[PDB]
């Protein structure tokens, strides 16, 4: 892969250039201390060190509410109401946002390709900014701090500008069309980023290694942990509807008033809420609170064979935005045993 | 066609005025026939046979008690709408006895008619599904009268407003400013209007049932922002004020 | 296309009234194409839809040779069965492709077969026991055990005791048992009280379950002690689903060690997977 | 996954009981401090704790020396000499070496599946044992410490006995043969395992985070540390020829003495040696030894995305065997900085 | 059958001395099967078996819709091609599948062509010459640059030139030239110099490169230089193999980002994956 270098007052050039191919989504302020990917018509108001986002990156391929079909009941058919999208330039995706989008497509892209998540993931740039971590930031537990493939380009922060690793087409085709606000790197620039990059790992607050959970998570189901943090739970999924790897959704029908036409929507709906594993009888397989509070737990904590990774990605929205302040990675770190210690 | 009637008991009139300021109502003419909606129609036949009753409004009267066992014995489908018909709504909000209000209120005047003391619809008469909401959103009566329309029924919904609060985006006031937004404890279909204008929710849509409304929770994290025991509980019970589980699942967390 | 959620219209043939809270259908696709070319494996389901009110799943319970007709063993316990149940022969219905791996029939050729069926679940299995009287030759003798509780709800009672002399003739002993109608002029006990019973040699026995879990321990722990070989016991669990693409995430079974997804990993398991992950039952 | 406990006292009985299902492979001794996967008939010789094995166990499945065909030039045919085994048993595979074998696995199983690999890999049962490391292993680094598939049976060791997991329905066969041999375990063997878990984290001499080697190894390319430790190496080939990760061979023609027997060997190879890449004419695109030896290290440090994994696993091999002694991990380090910190 | 190092054998029907260094053979399968179902991409590489010598990589120079003829230009420079000068017509040899990934002539369809080949590089470019000239529909003007450094060196140049009537009437300018030598009656400079005269649009040109890549910065230089566009450039690059199926482990070029493997990942390129992983040229 090329390294490009791009000075600092050279950024904003590049991307108003940017701005020519199509729509950008950047991070912006929505609140006091609140960040959300909203789409970008001014470029000053673009904050580049932000900390976490309150939407996942996967609103732009998994959309938040989708009408899947509009259907005719007389003469029954479902049209799929599919719109051609020009190819957006996703700007400011953290590392464990893009392992995040992976493992969506690896969920999304197997054996039946979804097509609404393909003709959104086929006509996107994904752009990766090295992050600086947080009080919440675990990503290197989960091993998401470095990405190799899905960005087109990289923006690593420099001290006298950015540097920019290509890595895939149409990042060649960007930087090549824009080769006058560019320069070269040489070791000046390398030293730095090392320098950069050896602070951004020692900055984690969490080191320690996360190998067997998997296999002691199931030995201690029946912890008090459990029980004692469920009820803490307030059971409003905001940890699994702003999580970045939440495969799941809730299908729905709605019937206009005149009782031949309606549409099908599609919606993000956590394992909190009761009606998701329901079946007919009023018999729920996960009845109480401290049920589908270990179920969504054990479900994060699977293994994707597909590249190695845990579902969880690390990225902290769960723990930062749960109102109750239920601390993912303590609770599971106190299933190791780093917080008791009693056996 | 559909028998549709819409009886009014104490109410505001806006979940009748919120049917009438959608525009879709035109296209339910052709689908279904009204009986009784005396704000729209003059003819309107207070006593005929109807497939589906939209009651709205809460009980209040010993002629509204009268006419919601009319109701129920001249009706196949009842539906309660609005958080007056659904849970008592904010006529009883006040736990004070009739006599204390009306003393208060009109002294010691005396009215030809019998007032009573507030109560939800679902005390009297056995409701069979409701559309939430104050008023309901055109949403659900969209939802609601398609779905009867069809031949089925609409489900009751168990999720909270932060629901389309996280999924429309809007900042969370709980996890910023720490106000007392019922969001968590509240049924959605509103879109989140309240946390989007950035006013905490309060109850505009009534707890969530099926025993999935976790208000001890709720409750400690109201404590922990400084809240009093007496201000959460003031704070629910707004729409909620008939509810039994709220002051015990508060105790609870109190105790 | 290519669109995965997409669907298939298809007709009601006949519906036949099975018992009180059952009812049986008969389906064609209106597409000549798809009819032709339609198969599916037995024990695959099919995502039934009717439109504007939602879609679920039913197993199929037909003979896949018979190329262009399915039958969907529907009860009425909710909304959209409600719906389905007023469906008269001669409507329409939007049906998804078939989903999920069936019964390992492919791998099964001349050992003798149990199938056991309890409670609602006789569909897979009396789609199994079709398709093996379809190629008889390539099985050796079959017990078809079928069970439920409240005795007029042994479904197709009617066509297994019409076909019964026929059965004893082909080295066929199909049982049918009631477990709560002392009442009933039958059998009463227990699966696991009939299976001791059974013709199967258990050295090359294989064998497949269905229905409540809550008697998969019994049925487990019954044919276990009798030396049926472990390695040969297939299993069917239902949990929510409303894709039956790997993208719901209702249908999430077992522990963070084995994570399975039904409409992906089953919904036919194996009993070295139902003991390795506690849970599933 | 069934978690079966195994005392101390029947597991030489297991052992016997298993050598039923056909031959053992067991590290047992060579010389004073070697180890080897030596095929066992006395089980009483096997030494249960081992730091490493002289050939990584990928000979039972990559023969060293193999015959692919035996060729007759006269009615010009290769016959494939393919001979029926037995199925295997291969007791005492560490965590790293498991890695190594799935990696092979996706090496040799891809697109076009080797049929002498395949039909070996067939036929084989891992057994993975819980190592201890010495001063060399650094599967940590590289994310190999716990096996997630791949085993049939895991052999945790405990104060009371061993610990088996139970991965898969030939290991369930396995055990359930012999389950009167078997105890069942409580919380009294969990904590200990958990206890010696813990032990094993701890006991690593490298703890550091390997995130950006791969990249910053093109950067550093011209490293003087590369002509030095190149000087310095012997140019033997042991660091390939025991690396349970090296894919390469190479493939020659024997023929017997007069007119018509043939047979193509095939034998593991690696960079150092000078016919690796040579082309006609004399020209060889790693020509120097510095070339070579920077070609064997980018390779190992490659990246699979198949797995996530580096194709190192960090058994400590070319390490350990180097007769200069030349570190893997120094120089890794050296290139990262965490050893010489001068830029 | 499933075994990949599987061969066929092989009956070379005619030799053609090409030049004093390289030589023209044609093949066909023995089996007719084979020979009627063989297929292969323009620019895929072929396994060449000498029985108990070894075997070669060559890459296919022939026409693909000529099913069952294939035709393989050979230099002698070492033990196994000296062994196959040797091979009178009519002998049989062992032959293995095609392997690798051809230039994408499906997706060349409707712009014009720049074929530039150098030195030993013209047989896969003669191949994609062929196959452009057999669907000369699909393709706009073509310019096919063949050179060499020797004037005698230049491969096929009696064919192109018999064809260079006929083919100025086709609006395709084949160029050659020579590099080296000055005492040869024709053009003379390096093959850069002769892309300016090239008739294809750079807007809406693809460019297929072979030969030795001490010339590719050159030309690569000289077509980014007259505003060809950079991601229609595809080259060709050879290392050692000794399997073809991704196992020998000697075809390796790049870097630690960049490890690609050439019998998987090429043997035809793109630009910017020559300009983005140093050391493949
Ligand atoms: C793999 C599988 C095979 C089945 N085979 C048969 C069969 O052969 N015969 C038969 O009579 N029934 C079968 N069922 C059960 C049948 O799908 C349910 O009775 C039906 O979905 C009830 O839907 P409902 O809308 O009326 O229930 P509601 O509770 O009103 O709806 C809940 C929704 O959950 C979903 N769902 C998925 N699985 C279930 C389930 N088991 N129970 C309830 N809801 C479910 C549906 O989308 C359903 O609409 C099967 C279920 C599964 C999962
Ligand atoms: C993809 C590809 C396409 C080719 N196409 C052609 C073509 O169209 N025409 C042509 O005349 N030549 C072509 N060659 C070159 C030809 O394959 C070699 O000259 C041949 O392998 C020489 O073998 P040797 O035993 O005489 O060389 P030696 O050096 O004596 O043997 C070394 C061994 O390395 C292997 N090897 C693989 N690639 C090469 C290579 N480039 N050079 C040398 N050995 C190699 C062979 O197995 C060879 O036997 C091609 C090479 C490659 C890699
Ligand atoms: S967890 Fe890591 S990748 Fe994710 S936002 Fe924080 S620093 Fe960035
Ligand atoms: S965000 Fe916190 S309180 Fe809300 S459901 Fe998740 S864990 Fe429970
Ligand atoms: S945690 Fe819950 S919502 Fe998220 S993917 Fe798992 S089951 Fe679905
Ligand atoms: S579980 Fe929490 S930390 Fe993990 S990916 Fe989901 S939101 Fe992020
Ligand atoms: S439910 Fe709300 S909108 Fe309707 S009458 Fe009562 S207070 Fe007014
Ligand atoms: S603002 Fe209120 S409704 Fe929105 S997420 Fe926070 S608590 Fe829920
Ligand atoms: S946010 Fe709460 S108060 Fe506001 S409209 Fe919705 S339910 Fe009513
Ligand atoms: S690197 Fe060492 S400690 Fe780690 S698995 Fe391999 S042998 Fe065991
Ligand atoms: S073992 Fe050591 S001396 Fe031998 S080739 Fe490898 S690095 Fe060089
Ligand atoms: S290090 Fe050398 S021998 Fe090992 S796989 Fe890489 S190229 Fe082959
Ligand atoms: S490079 Fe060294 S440490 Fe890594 S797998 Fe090979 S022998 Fe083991
Ligand atoms: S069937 Fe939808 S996730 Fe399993
Ligand atoms: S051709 Fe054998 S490894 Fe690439």
Known sequence: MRYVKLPKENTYEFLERLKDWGKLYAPVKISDKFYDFREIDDVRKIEFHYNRTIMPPKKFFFKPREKLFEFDISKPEYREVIEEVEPFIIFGV????????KILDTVYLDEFPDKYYKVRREKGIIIGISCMPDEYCFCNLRETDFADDGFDLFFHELPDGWLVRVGTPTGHRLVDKNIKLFEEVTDKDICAFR????????????????????????????????????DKCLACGICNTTCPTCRCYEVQDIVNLDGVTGYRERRWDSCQFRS?????????????????????????????????????????????????????????RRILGLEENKC | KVRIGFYALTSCYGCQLQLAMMDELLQLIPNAEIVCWFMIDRD?????????????????????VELVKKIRENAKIVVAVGACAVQGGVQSWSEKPLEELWKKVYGDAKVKFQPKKAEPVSKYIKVDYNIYGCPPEKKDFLYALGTFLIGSWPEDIDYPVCLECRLNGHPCILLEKGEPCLGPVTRAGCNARCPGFGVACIGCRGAIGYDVAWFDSLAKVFKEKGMTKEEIIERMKMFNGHDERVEKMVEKIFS | ??????????????????????????????????????????????????????????????????????????????????VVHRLKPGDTVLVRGPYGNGFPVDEWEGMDLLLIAAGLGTAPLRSVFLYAMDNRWKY???????????????????????????????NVKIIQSVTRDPNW???????????????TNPKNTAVAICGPPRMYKSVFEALINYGYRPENIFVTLERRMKCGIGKCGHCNVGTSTSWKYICKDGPVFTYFDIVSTPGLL
């Open chain 1, 94 to 101: 953290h590392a464990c946002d893009i392992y995040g989008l």
């Open chain 1, 195 to 230: 320098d950069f990059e050896k602070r951004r790992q020692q900055a984690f607050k969490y080191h320690e290694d996360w190998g067997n959970l998997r296999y002691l998570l199931e030995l201690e189901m029946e912890h008090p942990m459990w029980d004692e943090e469920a």
């Open chain 1, 276 to 332: 998701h594993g329901l079946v007919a009888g009023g018999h729920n397989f996960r009845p109480t609170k401290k049920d589908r509070f270990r179920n969504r737990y054990l479900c994060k904590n699977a293994y994707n064979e597909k590249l190695g990774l845990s579902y969880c990605v690390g990225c902290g929205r769960c723990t930062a935005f749960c109102p109750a302040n239920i601390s993912f990675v303590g609770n599971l």
């Open chain 2, 44 to 64: 309107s036949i207070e006593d005929e046979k109807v497939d589906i009753a939209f009651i709205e409004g809460s009980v209040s009267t010993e002629e509204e």
């Open chain 3, 1 to 82: 296309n290519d669109n995965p959620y997409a669907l298939h219209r298809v007709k009601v043939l006949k519906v036949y009234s099975l018992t009180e809270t059952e009812k049986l259908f008969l389906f064609r696709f209106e597409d000549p194409e798809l009819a032709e070319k339609w198969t599916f494996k037995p024990g695959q389901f099919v995502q039934l839809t009717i439109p504007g009110v939602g879609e679920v799943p039913i197993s199929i319970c037909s003979s896949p040779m018979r190329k262009g007709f399915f039958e969907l063993c529907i009860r009425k316990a909710g909304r959209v069965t409600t």
């Open chain 3, 140 to 170: 050796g003798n079959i017990t078809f055990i079928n069970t439920a509780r409240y005795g007029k709800d042994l479904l197709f009672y009617k066509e297994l005791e019409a076909m019964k002399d026929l059965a004893e003739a082909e």
């Open chain 3, 185 to 199: 002029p039958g059998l009463k006990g227990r699966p696991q009280q009939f299976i001791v019973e059974a013709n």
